[PDB]
Design a protein around this ligand. Structure first.
Ligand SMILES: O=C(O)Cc1csc(Nc2ccc(F)cc2)n1
Ligand SMILES: O=C(O)Cc1csc(Nc2ccc(F)cc2)n1
Ligand SMILES: [Zn+2]
Length: 356
């Protein structure tokens, strides 16, 4: 029963001190990079974005892998959507009132992600080989985001993403997103959409496009997650929302590990499970629908909705509802069918993947 789930959560806590030590290694190298980056013309306004739920600027994505986002204030943003994709954009600047720090990165009117990315890499790689006395090595993956993957003395991998910050109103494609009004309130949705949004270098084939990112809002709604403002602040108001997301992420990690002989699940990520989880929070807005005592039922709610998304081949980005993370363009039909069969078996047999 749910004792099996509570036992899984207890076992995960046993790794708590290890990944808090590794993150202490990440925080030291990232801070070292930020000081170098700020000395550069284009990057003087570079900073650490708040994306982690346990360490302020260091996000845990999976065992021993960390995500970090470097934000750069960029005024006078002008967005042009790339070919109805809803999430990808060309970046232009509001017509010249003197020249911007990023002038070096233009191609005609468009801000070149590859130009900007190349200088980001160079400055960081300088601080990998200028201080070759430290155990860090740098891999470069395909997509522009993550831009740089540092390996710290091996076993500790950290992805570093550059993110443009825009303080402008969110783009039209987000107008019907962030459907939190019945859960976190209209007042909160208004406040959240007054915050900046972010753009990361990413291509859709390849162009000089940027993709929207809302990692800071995601962190804020996960940490301040109750209909009650005092959810999880006292013994009378303990919900299981965070634990359900933890278990869903762990479920997917464990299945991918077991299906490593063929790797049919490599296109699925913790972002898919987190997005599905936010939809289930919208579906079940009351804290009484997440009572600690109901961990088993609540996890079943989360899994059942994830299964529905797989079977219908539809998982809307929580901020951009017309952006389908499960479209056949992104994940082929056979992979979604394959994951459906495995999750369906696990749900129908009380999750034996969690057995000891
Ligand atoms: O048996 C209980 O304690 C109550 C209950 C109701 S539904 C449910 N689901 C459930 C899901 C996964 C699991 F590994 C174990 C249980 N648990
Ligand atoms: O969101 C992340 O940082 C990681 C991740 C994994 S899959 C994915 N797709 C995605 C697509 C459009 C979008 F606007 C936001 C996200 N993003
Ligand atoms: Zn809570």
């Amino acid at each position: 029963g749910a004792s099996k789930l509570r036992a899984v959560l207890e076992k995960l806590k046993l790794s708590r001190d290890d990944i808090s030590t590794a993150a202490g290694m990440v925080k030291g190298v990232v801070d070292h990079l930020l000081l170098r980056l700020k000395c550069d013309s284009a990057f003087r306004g570079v900073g650490l974005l708040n994306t982690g739920s346990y360490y302020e600027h260091v996000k845990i994505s999976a065992p021993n892998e960390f995500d970090v986002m470097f934000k750069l204030e960029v005024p006078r943003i002008q967005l042009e959507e790339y070919s109805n994709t809803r999430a990808y954009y060309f970046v232009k600047f509001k017509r010249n009132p003197k020249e911007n720090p990023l002038s070096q990165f233009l191609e005609g009117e468009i801000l070149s992600a590859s130009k900007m990315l190349s200088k980001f890499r160079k400055i960081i790689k300088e601080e990998i080989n200028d201080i070759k006395d430290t155990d860090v090595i740098m891999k470069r993956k395909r997509g522009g985001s993550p831009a740089v993957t540092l390996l710290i003395s091996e076993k500790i991998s950290v992805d570093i993403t550059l993110a443009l910050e825009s303080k402008s109103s969110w783009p039209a494609s987000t107008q019907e997103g962030l459907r939190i009004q019945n859960w976190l309130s209209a007042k909160v949705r208004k406040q959240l959409r007054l915050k900046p949004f972010y753009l990361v270098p990413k291509h859709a084939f390849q162009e000089e496009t940027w993709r929207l990112s809302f990692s800071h809002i995601e962190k804020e709604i996960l940490n301040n997650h109750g209909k009650s403002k005092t959810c999880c602040e006292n013994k009378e108001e303990k919900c299981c929302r965070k634990d359900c997301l933890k278990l869903m992420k762990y479920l997917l990690e464990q299945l991918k590990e077991r299906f490593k002989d063929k790797k049919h699940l490599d296109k699925f990520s913790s972002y898919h499970v987190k997005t599905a989880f936010f939809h289930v929070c919208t579906q079940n807005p009351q804290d009484s629908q997440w009572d600690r005592k109901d961990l088993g039922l609540c996890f079943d709610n989360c899994v059942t909705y994830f299964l529905q998304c797989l079977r219908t081949e539809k998982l809307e980005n929580y901020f951009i509802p017309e952006f389908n993370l499960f479209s056949s363009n992104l994940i082929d039909k056979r992979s979604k069918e394959f994951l459906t069969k495995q999750i369906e078996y696990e749900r129908n047999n009380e999750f034996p993947v969690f057995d000891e």
